[PDB]
Scaffold this motif. Structure first.
Motif, short mmCIF file in Angstrom:
data_model
loop_
_atom_site.label_atom_id
_atom_site.label_comp_id
_atom_site.label_asym_id
_atom_site.label_seq_id
_atom_site.Cartn_x
_atom_site.Cartn_y
_atom_site.Cartn_z
N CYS A 1 53.11 29.93 -99.95
CA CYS A 1 54.43 29.92 -99.35
C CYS A 1 55.44 30.63 -100.22
CB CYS A 1 54.89 28.49 -99.10
SG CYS A 1 53.67 27.45 -98.34
N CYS B 1 51.21 21.42 -101.47
CA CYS B 1 52.36 21.96 -100.74
C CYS B 1 52.36 21.38 -99.33
CB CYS B 1 52.31 23.49 -100.67
SG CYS B 1 53.94 24.24 -100.46
N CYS C 1 54.56 22.38 -97.06
CA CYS C 1 54.61 23.63 -96.32
C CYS C 1 53.29 24.35 -96.50
CB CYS C 1 55.76 24.51 -96.81
SG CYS C 1 55.85 26.10 -95.98
N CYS C 2 52.64 24.66 -95.38
CA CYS C 2 51.31 25.22 -95.20
C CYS C 2 50.20 24.24 -95.55
CB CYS C 2 51.06 26.51 -96.00
SG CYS C 2 50.46 26.35 -97.70
#
Ligand code: ZN
Lengths: 112, 180, 135, 77, 91
Positions: free
Chosen positions: E41, E56, E58-59
């Motif tokens: 990311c 993470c 995010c992703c």
RNA sequence: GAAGACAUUGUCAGGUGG
RNA sequence: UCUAAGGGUCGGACGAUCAACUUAGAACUGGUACGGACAAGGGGAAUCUGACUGUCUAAUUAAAACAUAGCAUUGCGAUGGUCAGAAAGUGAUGUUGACGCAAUGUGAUUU
RNA sequence: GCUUGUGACGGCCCGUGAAAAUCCACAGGAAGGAAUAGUUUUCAUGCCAGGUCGUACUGAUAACCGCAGCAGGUCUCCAAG
RNA sequence: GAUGGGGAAGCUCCGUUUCAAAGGCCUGACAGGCCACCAUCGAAAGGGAAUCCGGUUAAGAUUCCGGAACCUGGAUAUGGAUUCUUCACGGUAACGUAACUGAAUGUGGAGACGUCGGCGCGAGCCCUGGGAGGAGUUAUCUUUUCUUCUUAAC
């Protein structure tokens, strides 16, 4: 304030032996034995919740018809509607790259 | 040992590992119950029967989920992968290495530890490698070792500052605490 | 350039036909009042034809080579292009912006393309199309 | 139990060869400011499930009571 | 506001366990609980847990790392010597 | 695969030895 | 017995309706007593010891005793270290492997 | 407002905080089947059956254990103004 | 904690899937072919198929009676749907509807999961306005004080 008796013989405040109270017609409270919660089924690839499906107890799925435990498309009752989209085009692009390696290997063996 | 997911083992020295390689894939990375290091659920395709064969490797650092492992003997030198130690030169750092070929690993397994190949005896195949303790030892080449250090180096630097944390530590492995 | 054409083949990504190949017949880059976006009338299949071999009989291949067509409107973004192509002139006029109504139209529009794909797959042209993308 | 909105649906549940017995109930309720009107409740013993029908009009009740078969055993209240 | 002069982040433990130890545990505590850069990311949304792991949201990707950091200087140097030795041995 | 007439196992004799 | 501040819901500068106990401020008053009962820390100046939370000699001892995290040393690379079995085709640590396993003196800190 | 349940979040750890029986789905497509008639019993209706054992009572400064109808002890739910 | 097996002079012991010929099918003309475990025991507080109310007795009820639902396992008729294009259609998609075949094998999901904090939501209880009923104080005051006004499973 009226006070309430467990109806089942387990006296304890277990995960299962749970108590919701409900008032009744005849004018005496009683306890009412709720049962455990469902859970959203999940994505084998995403780890994400997937829609359209009824959150039901596992044998309780056997009563309902095909629709409530399913959606229409392929990979219906197991997948995310985005993880399907990812893997499908993965399977398409690397299927094309198989042809890419085909033209590479036939080129070099033609050179040989 | 209630929660111990599985022994931090290697694949077996099958025909693929012995005359080629194989692509095997990680699915997740999980904390072991009572271990200084993490583990990795990692899966292969059983080539004799139609199914996805799970394996439990130890988690070297640098490796992420969504990753592939070409592995066997003809595998490119990259982190996370595995080879028998003959194909690589000296200096390739590895971990979780085997004493005998196919014992699925005795040495260089603990957290943030590794070993260092320094020499080869290519004729009459062996390979020279130093231990974390530093004792030199020369072993056959056909036995294997995973690239890179065990993840989690620097677990030891932190103090604990109270007894309850040590009790939570040593409840898990063995009742060798409180000590006299 | 607008490499998307109406002699073009593509794939479905969503909506009950994904993992099945289709072909474009009528792109509309700015759509219409309905379908208010870049869309395209397309057609494809719903039940791929099973594979055949030497030893199968006429009845076996007849059962295996039955095929289910379909026609639908789709946003462009819900498709993927493809280098391959197909001959499209046969079934241009049967499909239309109004053909997705009063399904007496729709079922005959399915039957024409059913016969078309059958005659095509027999003496198979676009073998790659007619075989199922696996996934 | 279950509720009904269509009488052309209803009129075969009373002929479906599971029913032996059914009943009528009457109810005294008041609509929005309205006026106190009797309200009929036709109930029929479907063996797997009780089927009811709520009706406010009395002329329709007189219609249906006569429309139903003579052999069927009804009770009141 | 910066509410203290030198005790900083480990002040919950209080006056106990010695300053020489509080300094080291503070040095590692800032490192473990901060948010770190995703390789994929490029986002400061990477959090550890169950020590050894780095994750993470995010992703959704996860990676092993140090006990209290995403990565070590040993990780850096073995990465660099691998970048060398792969190119050396392959050709 | 390792190892191989050594190991080892069964039985005997030295030094040490709460 | 009063004042002020602290709000929602309904209309296009503000207004109509709806309701809560929180604080502050000014008076008047009587046993000049008012946390009125009940419930409820006595505090401080010097010396020594163990670092601390903690554990126990129930049925004469509840500490200046015990453990504790730390520090430093020593051993072991698997036919290995520790430890056990009547003997075994035995057995724990061990689903482990030197940032580990184990025994040490000692117990936070400055020096 | 009191108690309790659930949800979305956050912190928490060298502690990351179980496995199985069972149920369902998905990919896969052996094969079966209609036109003068079949297929669907995971939709709706409709029919028969659901066996063995426990189940009372007290749960305590009298119903138990403490040589006893002993100022003792024994896990737990409801919890008003 | 059996059996295999191995020790033990021996009572009985080590071990629990391992130095085992361990078990059953699937068509299909006695012959071919596939599969791979290993026992079993152990929770009336863990997992787990499904039920409520009212009434009833000298004494018990999610057990009986009255009424009303549900689960599982069977057979089998009908209705409905699908079909002469045989295994439905619609919606861009999220997904939907009354259903809408499918074995061997494979994969995934539920069951399946910590502690504490604060925040929202709702349930029950508490405060109570108005109305209708019943009781009680009323030498004197109090449009007052107390109680009832409820509604399950599915
Ligand atoms: Zn990320």
């Amino acid at each position: 304030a009226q006070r309430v008796t467990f109806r089942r013989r387990n006296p304890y405040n277990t995960r299962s032996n749970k108590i919701k109270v409900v008032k009744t017609p005849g004018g005496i409270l009683r306890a009412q034995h709720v049962k455990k919660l469902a859970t959203r089924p999940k994505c084998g690839d995403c780890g994400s919740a997937l829609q359209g499906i009824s959150t039901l107890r596992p044998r309780q799925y056997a009563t309902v018809s095909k629709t409530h435990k399913t959606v229409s498309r392929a990979y219906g009752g197991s997948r995310c509607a985005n993880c399907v989209k990812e893997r499908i085009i993965r399977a398409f692009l690397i299927e094309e790259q198989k042809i890419v390696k085909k033209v590479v290997k036939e080129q070099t063996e033609a050179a040989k | 040992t209630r929660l111990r997911q599985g022994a931090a083992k290697l694949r077996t020295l099958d025909y693929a590992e012995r005359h080629g390689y194989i692509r095997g894939i990680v699915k997740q990375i999980v904390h072991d119950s009572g271990r200084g290091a993490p583990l990795a659920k990692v899966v292969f395709r059983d080539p004799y029967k139609y199914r996805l064969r799970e394996e439990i490797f130890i988690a070297n650092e640098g490796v992420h989920t969504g990753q592939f492992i070409y592995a066997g003997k003809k595998a490119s030198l990259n982190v996370g992968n595995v080879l028998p130690l003959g194909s690589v030169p000296e200096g390739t750092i590895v971990s979780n290495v085997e004493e005998k070929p196919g014992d699925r690993g005795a040495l260089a397994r603990a957290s943030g530890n590794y070993v260092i190949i320094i020499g080869h005896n290519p004729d009459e195949n062996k390979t020279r490698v130093r231990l974390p303790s530093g004792a030199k030892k020369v072993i056959s080449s056909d036995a294997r070792g995973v690239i890179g250090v065990i993840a989690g180096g620097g677990r030891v630097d932190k103090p604990l500052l109270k007894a309850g944390r040590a009790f939570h530590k040593y409840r898990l492995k063995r009742n060798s605490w409180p000590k006299t | 350039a607008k490499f998307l054409k109406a002699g073009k083949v593509a794939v479905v990504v969503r909506g009950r036909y994904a993992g099945k190949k289709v072909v474009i017949v009528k792109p509309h880059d700015e759509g219409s009042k309905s379908h208010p976006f870049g869309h395209a009338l397309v057609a494809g299949i719903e039940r791929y034809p099973l594979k055949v071999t030497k030893k199968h009989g006429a009845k076996k291949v007849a059962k295996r080579t039955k095929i289910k067509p379909f026609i639908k409107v789709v946003n462009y973004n819900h498709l993927l292009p493809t280098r391959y192509t197909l001959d499209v002139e046969a079934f241009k006029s049967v499909v239309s912006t109004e053909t997705f109504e009063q399904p007496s139209q729709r079922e005959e529009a399915k039957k024409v393309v059913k016969k078309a794909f059958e005659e095509r797959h027999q003496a198979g042209k676009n073998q790659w199309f007619f075989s199922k993308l696996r996934f | 139990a279950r509720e009904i909105t269509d009488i052309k649906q209803f009129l075969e549940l009373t002929r479906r060869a599971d029913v032996k017995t059914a009943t009528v109930k009457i109810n005294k309720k008041l609509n929005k400011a309205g006026k106190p009107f009797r309200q009929t409740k036709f109930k029929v013993r479907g063996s797997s499930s009780l089927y009811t029908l709520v009706i406010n009009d009395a002329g329709k009740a007189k219609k249906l009571i006569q429309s139903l078969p003579p052999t069927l055993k009804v009770n009141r209240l | 506001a910066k509410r203290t002069k030198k005790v900083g982040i480990t002040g919950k433990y209080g006056v106990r366990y010695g300053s020489s130890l509080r300094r080291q545990v503070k040095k590692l505590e800032i490192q473990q609980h901060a948010r770190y850069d995703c390789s994929f990311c490029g986002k400061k949304t990477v959090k550890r847990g169950a020590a050894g792991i780095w994750t993470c949201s995010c992703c959704k990707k996860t990676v092993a790392g140090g006990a209290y950091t995403v990565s070590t200087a040993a990780a850096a140097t073995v990465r660099s010597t691998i970048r060398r030795l792969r190119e050396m041995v392959e050709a």
